[PDB]
Design a protein around this ligand. Structure first.
Ligand SMILES: *[C@@H]1O[C@H](CO)[C@@H](O)[C@H](O)[C@H]1O
Ligand SMILES: *[C@@H]1O[C@H](CO)[C@@H](O)[C@H](O)[C@H]1O
Lengths: 474, 318
């Protein structure tokens, strides 16, 4: 039969009856049917009008010189007569699904779990020929007969999403084969194997199969964002990335700890979890920073890998570990269970020094502020002479931004010239000290502005640096 | 609903009624509507005549083998019957505007001022699917959820020139992110994400942000024209480039001093200015060369930088 190909267990049928559809690469049979009763036909309407189709010869491809349309022996007509409609071949969709479900195409899969895979597809040419599957090893050899599992090579129309052998689709047991890159080729049974009728779907086999974690860098300073990637995991399942609260800085607050993990990449939810309760990033309702013990960030995976990110700022200068957990574990229940895998990185301190305000300074003169700051966002300048560190009012926002080269600069500023009581110290001739400090002060707790006079302990406690300067008369 | 997508808060609708429009990359729904009551249709007139459209399968792209036109189940006809008109997808225009206004696309913007940016666009496919926005870091990661500011990802039709959140458009607060090159990707919600339906708009983040001036050369002789460029400035605003009259040659005349700055590049007006009055290049009406004290050349900026030029001739060797 044609249209119902499997009713007769025939792989292909090439006898065309009046009214049916014919595809571009077909080779009509001339023995019987409309292959000897009317060998040549002509176009009826539209672009096809006037053109000639010869059934005996193979129908040309390329859709040029043979425009698509309806063909009638007589010519342009509307009366019932032997007619046929030319259509292009196509396969609309194809996929490889695990027995549970979920696509793994184009992504590496564990050898252990690659034992019940299925291949399903949707194609346009179902009335004429079924579509073959040919698995090829990285060496380039047909391995279809080895991995086949009880089903004929022919895959049926529809049957996309079929996780069982009852529905159309072919089952492959890819557990026995070694590691490598394999290509599954789909093409028509006999003739429809040219462009747009064939597809090559890749698949990677590998046995390094522990859930893996990698970092683009291992040795970083505070504040430098680091992107971490999880590798070799089941698609569609949610892992958990943990953070030990011991590694956090002692002076952190509740709101200060909820920003350690970003929502970057495939991450869904972030938060901190106690043994029994959790405080998510949505609201500050669960445990507090002292009450909670773990920081988590539930992350999904799309394909074979997922990407997240961390913020090294507000982290102690020591070895930092990342712990992953098995799929399906809850955040609260994962406090005691051991991590499936881990990765460690080292964190070192960063320096912030001044260059230009050093050695000599003429009172009332103007000079630029030149220096560097490895891990800083806003910096402030303070002046000390036999007592407190009086803040120097540089002007706009009392801060200087830092570029990517970890260097900050300011235009020519008269230190004594500027208005303020800080300049009055520099007005008189003598020897003083000048230093820079990061934005860790932030009004020693309060509004986001550097407005204080930090003492020796406060200035030294944070990251800062000072150098001796003396002012000479004009 | 279809045509009024937000009346039902639905991101997409795939039930087609008789008479509507269908696009190239759509995947009609066969569950209900004109997806089970008439699966296949045929061309009616023109190039489309005689060709067959199957609604069940995804409509082919490339506009070849599926010519654009109107499709009717019966064939060529003019009587009322289930019919549909095939149209191509398109997004006619897209832009990123600062809260004040003014395009900054493809141009570096200061981190401080990049805190209230907006994205607006005009697209053809509004009846079927809205168009998504995806911000990508230079590392190549979706950062949309971090910079979003209180509005759903969907941007509406029209709403170009909207500087407020009331109108369609998405607000991005790009102040927190570090320096780098970011790419904003616009593409259809579900299927219309192929060529001509997607756009990548670049944007540069940088924090070296003082208004900068550069010269193609520093050591030159008299008479050699030098081109100077202003960098990292707000688009649409007029800066002022000044010249100290002390540097001019002593033997210069009034007409001899008005040609120090050329009208090259983005410069609008040139002239000499006294403390209270100005003598522009249009006429010799204001202060004279001895009376005036500064020489200026008001210059606009188109994008992130503007170019001007100077004439080292009649300048003291210093
Ligand atoms: C193709 O189909 C026709 C119609 O049933 C049959 O007669 C032929 O034997 C088969 O090849
Ligand atoms: C698409 O629109 C139709 C018409 O209102 C509605 O019935 C469907 O539920 C929606 O998906």
């Amino acid at each position: 039969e044609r249209g119902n190909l499997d009713a007769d267990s025939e792989s292909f049928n090439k006898t065309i009856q009046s009214g049916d559809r014919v595809f571009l690469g077909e080779e009509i049979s001339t023995d019987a049917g409309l292959g000897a009763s009317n060998p040549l036909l002509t176009g009826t309407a539209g672009n096809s009008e006037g053109v000639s189709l010869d059934l005996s010869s193979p129908i040309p491809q390329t859709t040029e010189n043979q425009p698509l349309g309806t063909y009638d022996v007589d010519g342009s007509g509307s009366a019932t007569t032997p007619n046929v409609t030319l259509l292009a071949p196509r396969i609309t969709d194809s996929e490889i699904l695990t027995s549970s479900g979920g696509d793994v195409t184009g992504s590496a899969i564990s050898s252990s779990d690659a034992g019940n895979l299925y291949v399903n597809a949707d194609y346009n040419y179902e009335s004429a020929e079924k579509v073959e599957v040919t698995v090829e090893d990285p060496s380039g050899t047909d391995i279809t007969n080895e991995v086949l599992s009880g089903t004929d090579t022919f895959v049926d129309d529809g049957s996309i999403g079929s996780t069982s052998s009852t529905g159309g689709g072919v089952g492959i047991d890819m557990s026995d084969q070694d590691a490598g890159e394999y290509t599954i080729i789909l093409e028509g049974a006999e003739d429809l194997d040219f462009g747009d009728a064939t597809e090559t779907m890749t698949l990677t086999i590998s046995s390094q199969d522990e859930i893996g974690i990698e970092l683009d860098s291992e040795s970083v300073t505070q504040g430098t964002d680091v992107q971490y990637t999880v590798t070799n995991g089941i698609d569609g399942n949610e892992h958990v990335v943990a953070m030990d609260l011991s590694d956090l800085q002692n002076d952190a607050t509740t709101e200060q700890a909820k920003e350690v993990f970003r929502n970057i990449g495939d991450t869904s939810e972030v938060g901190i979890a106690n043994s029994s309760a959790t405080n998510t990033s949505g609201s500050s309702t669960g445990p507090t920073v002292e009450t909670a013990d773990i920081a988590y960030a539930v992350v999904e995976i799309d394909g074979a890998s997922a990407v997240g990110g961390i913020e090294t700022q507000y982290l102690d200068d020591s070895e930092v570990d990342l712990e992953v957990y098995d799929a399906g574990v809850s955040a609260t229940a994962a406090v005691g269970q051991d991590a499936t895998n881990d990765i460690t990185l080292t964190i070192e301190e960063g320096g912030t020094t001044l260059s230009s305000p050093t050695g000599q300074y003429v009172v009332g003169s103007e000079v630029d502020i030149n220096g560097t700051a490895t891990s800083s966002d806003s910096v402030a300048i303070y002046v000390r002479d036999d007592g407190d560190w009086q803040l120097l009012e540089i002007g706009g926002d009392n801060e200087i931004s830092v570029d990517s080269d970890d260097t900050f600069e300011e235009e020519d500023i008269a230190l004594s010239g500027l208005s303020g009581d800080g300049s009055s110290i520099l007005s008189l001739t003598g020897t003083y000290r000048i230093g820079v400090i990061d934005a860790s002060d932030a009004d020693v707790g309060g509004d986001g502005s550097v407005d204080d006079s930090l003492t020796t302990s406060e200035f030294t406690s944070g990251v800062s640096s000072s150098n001796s300067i003396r002012v000479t008369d004009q």
